[PDB]
């Protein structure tokens, strides 16, 4: 939110008011948050805006036990596709610091290995609060069993975002696998819900991510004290939070896809961040 | 930007990802700002969000010389349609305080008469900076020769907005009546421009409106010192500013229409704020 200097002169195609970018999908939520699909953004304009703020993006990823095997491909493909041209700080949380692969990084990019012993929400909020506030402007929190195949850039950045789960974007809300037991803090009735957000890709400003992760951690602790575990764990709580605190952007399933499970439907022009067999 | 409490439970239609709200118009800019049309927003969700922040909206209007005649209809229709349910502070700038009509206001709404002797941008920035920062969260700056016919509410609120001029929303950029002389600070080349914004309806947070009005006032003073007056005066400068500082929402021409001049085209589902004969 600091003073924003003027954009330079730029030559690009004029947006046309009577020509939608995309007619096949919803590109704005009913609370006026953009839903990010290919064709909705001019990345040159966005890159200018975010570079003029010297934006730094933190990316958190957990690689515990056997999941350290996923780091090499995750990080090497992140170097090809994630926020290229911007300042990036990777935070790799692991129980095996020596198993973190030595990955060559582009300029302006750094990696920190954070040793650790549910945990994700606690670890993001409780332990790293002060560090993240000092070091980055935005946090992006993702699963490790993944690879980048195409551009994932500043179009995602906003105070708070979630990602449409690739298995549920066409589903009606009654079919969503929200927690349905009223005894859980994650409870959502059958007549509520905007979207089903996937636990493996959310983010926002540091402040908003710390709010989300704190709230989810607190709600998970209440459930534990009451002897209940939400059906989809942290994802159930994330869904409850984003129902009650609307995200300021929503990422389309371009941003979290499983090609082996779901193919490559017409509505996806790009597959950006995709599941690796586990 | 203060801590946002949770929304309550709400029952409303599920947004459907594979059903666009509107297929006939562009509903998001290439820099991911919503373009506000009827059908794109659920006003119940937005009202909740903004009431939970106890939002106060300031509305500035100038009524100098014969234009004091427009105040009664302007204000009486604003009471019917502008931010109803929210805190509103009208700021009426006039050379004839005694000619301001006595208009009955709903609860939580107030009106201040500010006596005055180009001026609008200066008067909004220079003279009223401290007052607005203390009194309101957002400023909305409009022409007085107008009436409200339908809802104008919190869907417009955002850090910085402009409104699509009703005569130019279908025009290509070369046809826009931007200032075209390189000697003016408002100069825009024929290969630049997103939209033609109308000078009679802009706004944003107090901070962003003070930035815009300060910059436009400064640019107008430079032009005056150089012996040039932009083709459309403050509107030319507003257009230059919004080209270089992209608005975070854009209002459709629903929000500034002239029915006598332009009728009621199919693309307009509502005529919200409309020209009165002058
Ligand atoms: O032994 C493990 C298990 C998990 N993880 C981490 O936790 C993530 C999530 O586990 P994963 O096995 O990838 O589960 P998924 O079924 O892909 O997870 C989905 O469902 C989970 C809820 O059950 C959410 O926590 C996830 O974010 C959501 O993407 C992994 O990517 C790792 O980052 C480890 O590091 N080691
Ligand atoms: O004698 C006057 C003249 C103007 N105004 C104020 O200035 C506004 C703009 O003048 P108007 O006569 O309404 O001009 P328009 O042609 O409707 O204005 C368009 O074009 C102007 C640039 O020429 C911009 O300043 C306007 O905001 C834009 O709406 C009026 O609504 C009043 O608020 C007065 O109060 N008294
Ligand atoms: C065979 C696996 C079928 C999984 C289909 C639905 O995806 C699952 O949805 C759950 C919520 O209902 C939860 O988010 C886990 C999620 O499964 C993960 O994501 C899928 C897209 C696959 O990549 C799967 O392997 C992975 O476990
Ligand atoms: C007869 C008047 C024709 C005006 C058509 C175009 O509107 C004018 O556009 C100018 C920029 O090119 C500038 O914004 C003034 C604007 O005219 C105002 O707005 C129109 C929509 C009408 O309401 C008009 O009466 C008013 O002066
Ligand atoms: Mn996973
Ligand atoms: Mn006018």
Write up what this structure looks like:
Two copies of one chain form a homodimer. With 278 residues, chain A is α/β, with parallel strands linked by helices. The first copy, chain A, has one domain (1-278): Spore Coat Polysaccharide Biosynthesis Protein SpsA, Chain A (Alpha-Beta Complex), CATH 3.90.550.10. In chain A, 26% of the residues lie in helices and 17% in strands. Chain A is built from seven helices and ten strands. In chain A, the strands form two sheets. Chain A has an eight-stranded mixed sheet with strand order 1-9-7-8-5-2-3-4, with helices on one face. Chain A has a two-stranded antiparallel ribbon with strand order 6-10. In chain A, helix 2 links the parallel strand 2 (56-63) and strand 3 (87-94). In chain A, helix 3 (119-127) crosses helix 5 and helix 5 crosses helix 6. Chain A is globular. Chains A and B meet through strand 1 and helix 1 of A and strand 1 and helix 1 of B. It is classed as transferase. The entry lists the keywords Glycosyltransferase Deoxyinhibitor ABO(H) Blood-Group System Complex, transferase.
């Amino acid at each position: 939110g600091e003073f924003m200097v003027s954009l330079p002169r730029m030559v690009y195609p004029q947006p046309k008011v009577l020509t939608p970018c995309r007619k096949d999908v919803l590109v704005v939520t009913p609370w006026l948050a953009p839903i990010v699909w290919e064709g909705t953004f001019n990345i040159d304009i966005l890159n200018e805006q975010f570079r003029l703020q010297n934006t730094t993006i933190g990316l958190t990823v957990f690689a515990i036990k056997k999941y350290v095997a996923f780091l090499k491909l995750f990080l090497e493909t992140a170097e090809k596709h994630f926020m290229v041209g911007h300042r990036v700080h990777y935070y790799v949380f692991t129980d095996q610091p020596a198993a973190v692969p030595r990955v060559t990084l582009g300029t302006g990019r750094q990696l920190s290995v954070l040793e650790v012993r549910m945990r994700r929400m606690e670890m993001i909020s409780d332990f790293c609060e002060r560090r993240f506030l000092s070091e980055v402007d935005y946090l992006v929190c993702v699963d490790v069993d993944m690879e980048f195949r195409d551009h994932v850039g500043v179009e995602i950045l906003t105070p708070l975002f979630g990602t449409l789960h690739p298995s549920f974007y066409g589903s009606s809300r009654e079919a969503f696998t929200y927690e349905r037991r009223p005894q859980s803090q994650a409870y959502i009735p059958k007549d509520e819900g905007d979207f089903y957000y996937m636990g493996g890709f959310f983010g926002g400003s540091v402040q908003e991510v710390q709010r989300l992760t704190r709230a989810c951690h607190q709600a998970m602790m209440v459930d534990q004290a009451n002897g209940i575990e939400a059906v989809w764990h942290d994802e159930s709580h994330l869904n409850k939070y984003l129902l009650r605190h609307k995200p300021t952007k929503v990422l389309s399933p371009e941003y979290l896809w499983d090609q082996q499970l779901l193919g490559w439907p017409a509505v996806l022009r790009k597959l950006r961040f995709t599941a690796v067999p586990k």
